[PDB]
Ligand SMILES: CC(C)CCC[C@@H](C)[C@H]1CC[C@H]2[C@@H]3CC=C4C[C@@H](O)CC[C@]4(C)[C@H]3CC[C@]12C
């Protein structure tokens with residue numbers, strides 16, 4: 151028998167995988183490096199991730215073509231094989247863990263909206279941890295090495311040698327950040343409901359004690375119903391402070407005994423709650439719109455790596471499956487995840503108007 155020639159596949163991948171991977175990540179790095187409106191702390195995640203996926207298209211992907219164009223005889227120097235295999239597992243694991251770090255980070259931005267500055271250092275710490283985790287996962291490859299009389303080596307991980315690494319490594323590289331991003335998913339669904347619920351609670355506590363005052367025919371109705379709003383009240387240090395002093399300024403009229411004067415102070419306070427509720431109504435509308443975008447984009451990413459890591463584990467556990475027909479799948483399924491990681495940064499940043507504006511400027515060679 152005979153297999154034939156598979157050059158048209160390598161041409162197809164360059165046009166639709168390697169070129170989009172190299173081009174998309176380079177656009178993302180330029181947007182953070184050039185445009186200063188994007189030089190925030192959370193975008194250093196996007197830059198760190200864009201550099202990892204860029205290194206895939208430059209070093210990992212071109213060598214991976216040689217398995218498709220050429221034969222099963224490693225055509226490059228020997229040490230290059232475990233180095234390429236090390237870089238392959240390293241950068242492919244970094245991309246999945248960056249998204250887990252982003253999923254966790256963005257959940258913290260919702261649940262604990264307060265922390266800010268300190269944020270520049272916290273990212274570099276989280277970036278480092280993500281890269282160190284990817285090193286410890288990819289380090290078994292250059293340590294064990296590829297087995298050899300014939301100096302010709304076959305550069306691929308085998309089931310006999312890396313059977314435990316193909317399994318436990320898959321557990322730590324994909325299914326562990328998968329399980330985390332699933333947990334942070336429901337944490338974010340719950341965090342946004344309570345954030346919107348707490349709002350409905352305060353909105354009525356104000357609007358109920360307000361109608362009490364406009365219908366008040368005495369001062370005691372104003373005294374007690376205003377204290378209910380006193381304990382129920384950077385920019386946040388001043389947000390409540392505006393109305394905490396107004397309730398005090400209005401109770402000052404209530405301690406005087408002025409009924410019509412105090413009621414007029416409350417009816418003119420309603421133009422102050424609509425200034426803070428409308429602002430925080432949006433903060434929660436936008437906090438919910440960005441979560442649904444990150445949810446779908448991160449899901450399609452993780453979904454396009456499911457074929458490889460399920461087959462990568464099945465090739466270890468299933469003793470009755472056809473090894474020839476299963477490694478033929480890994481040869482293909484890897485390129486699906488290569489696409490997933492290659493364009494994941496670009497897709498996620500296409501939903502940012504500032505990023506999308508920067509891209510449209512750079513594709514026509516502007517650079518401001
Ligand atoms: C045949 C293979 C190996 C080579 C593929 C060519 C690649 C490297 C070329 C083809 C198109 C190129 C991109 C075309 C557009 C831009 C916009 C520019 O503002 C930044 C560089 C960037 C993003 C280029 C980066 C390099 C690029 C992706």
Ligand SMILES: COc1ccc(C[C@@H]2NCCc3c2[nH]c2ccc(C)cc32)c(Cl)c1OC
Nearest residue numbers: 214217238239242316319320323480481484
């Ligand atoms: C030529 O095409 C191919 C190119 C590269 C590879 C290796 C693969 N690269 C994606 C990441 C990853 C791989 N292996 C792991 C084993 C364990 C862990 C944790 C991760 C990984 C294969 Cl398997 C190819 O198919 C034959």
